[PDB]
């Protein structure tokens, strides 16, 4: 049992897992990261797969993430890789390419997508898709990285956090959250005061 | 696929469910409530035990639900037809016999329960427990019962609300509330506005 949510905004992604959070790069060209909710099997699976091709693919005509020319193509090649690992839930894979946005996609079971937009800008996969009712509500697509960060970590209630900034093509701000960081103590404390406090306000309000 | 919550406070007791909410009572003596999240049949079977021992039962030393000296007693009895039906999701139950405090139950497949203390105050069914992590953070055993079942319809993010008021012995805050209603919807986007300023003011603190 596993959550993971992703966001893409403006300024680029962020993605969190509770590995099921996954990295691919070539420096200064493309960027990818895959989360997993499944089982450890299902996870080592599709990520095989795509390395197997990364790794030793003999057709040029096969397309690969590092051979991808944007990313709707890149989310097919998980797609494949997503459904051909049934012969042995969802995926979100997100990232960027050169010459193209940061594109975020959910994949579901049978390699089939859906891409992330400014209406929806974020995916949750786990079995509990915890404090879905607040990213709903709070979520917005022109949050800053570490704000749609915070609001992901909050949901969360083992955390690998990455944020990507947009046109860096590398992952650096890279983040393991435990559960006795005293950082996130703090935020999740001042965020039930104020859960109370927004409770007590809308208590004027009848049925 | 059902939501059920329930709510025990110093004033009394609060029960919500998306039929699904059942209704026992003998008046100025004891009212009981049933919530189910289960399927049609498995609640029809539970309901129709419990109905078949207050309207058939020949022995006398049968606790039945009109019976019963005491809320655990009574909780006994819907743990014995719950188990009873296997043979044919968690159940909610509670309510107040005259000489004692209301009381709140939460019933597992088995017939086993644990009951509602002040520490933790309600209980959720279902396969998704919506808004547990705002339930978690906002919900204390002092509160009004006017504030508790709003509380509970926001977590609903169909809805049958019943309001027991201790000591009354009867149920007649009885409401059902459409997705229409104009009242629920200002209060869920009062909710919203909340939610976006509570986020605001906690953005202050770091990872
Ligand atoms: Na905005
Ligand atoms: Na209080």
């Given at each position: 049992?596993?959550?993971?949510?992703?966001?893409?905004?403006?300024?680029?992604?962020?993605?969190?897992?509770?590995?099921?959070?996954?990295?691919?790069?070539?420096?200064?060209?493309?960027?990818?990261?895959?989360?997993?909710?499944?089982?450890?099997?299902?996870?080592?699976?599709?990520?095989?797969?795509?390395?197997?091709?990364?790794?030793?693919?003999?057709?040029?005509?096969?397309?690969?993430?590092?051979?991808?020319?944007?990313?709707?193509?890149?989310?097919?090649?998980?797609?494949?890789?997503?459904?051909?690992?049934?012969?042995?839930?969802?995926?979100?894979?997100?990232?960027?390419?050169?010459?193209?946005?940061?594109?975020?996609?959910?994949?579901?079971?049978?390699?089939?997508?859906?891409?992330?937009?400014?209406?929806?800008?974020?995916?949750?996969?786990?079995?509990?898709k915890?404090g879905k009712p607040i990213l709903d509500r709070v979520?917005?697509?022109?949050?800053?990285?570490?704000?749609?960060?915070?609001?992901?970590?909050?949901?969360?209630?083992?955390?690998?956090?990455?944020?990507?900034?947009?046109?860096?093509?590398?992952?650096?701000?890279?983040?393991?959250?435990?559960?006795?960081?005293?950082?996130?103590?703090?935020?999740?404390?001042?965020?039930?005061?104020?859960?109370?406090?927004?409770?007590?306000?809308?208590?004027?309000?009848?049925?």
């Amino acid at each position: 049992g596993t959550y993971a949510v992703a966001f893409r905004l403006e300024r680029g992604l962020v993605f969190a897992a509770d590995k099921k959070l996954q990295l691919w790069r070539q420096p200064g060209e493309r960027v990818f990261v895959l989360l997993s909710a499944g089982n450890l099997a299902a996870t080592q699976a599709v990520v095989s797969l795509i390395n197997e091709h990364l790794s030793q693919e003999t057709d040029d005509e096969v397309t690969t993430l590092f051979t991808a020319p944007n990313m709707y193509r890149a989310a097919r090649v998980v797609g494949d890789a997503v459904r051909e690992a049934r012969s042995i839930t969802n995926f979100i894979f997100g990232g960027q390419i050169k010459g193209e946005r940061p594109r975020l996609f959910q994949i579901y079971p049978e390699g089939n997508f859906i891409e992330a937009t400014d209406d929806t800008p974020f995916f949750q996969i786990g079995e509990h898709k915890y404090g879905k009712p607040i990213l709903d509500r709070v979520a917005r697509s022109d949050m800053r990285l570490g704000e749609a960060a915070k609001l992901m970590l909050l949901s969360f209630d083992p955390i690998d956090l990455v944020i990507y900034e947009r046109d860096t093509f590398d992952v650096t701000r890279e983040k393991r959250i435990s559960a006795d960081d005293e950082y996130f103590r703090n935020l999740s404390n001042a965020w039930s005061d104020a859960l109370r406090q927004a409770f007590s306000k809308i208590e004027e309000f009848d049925v």
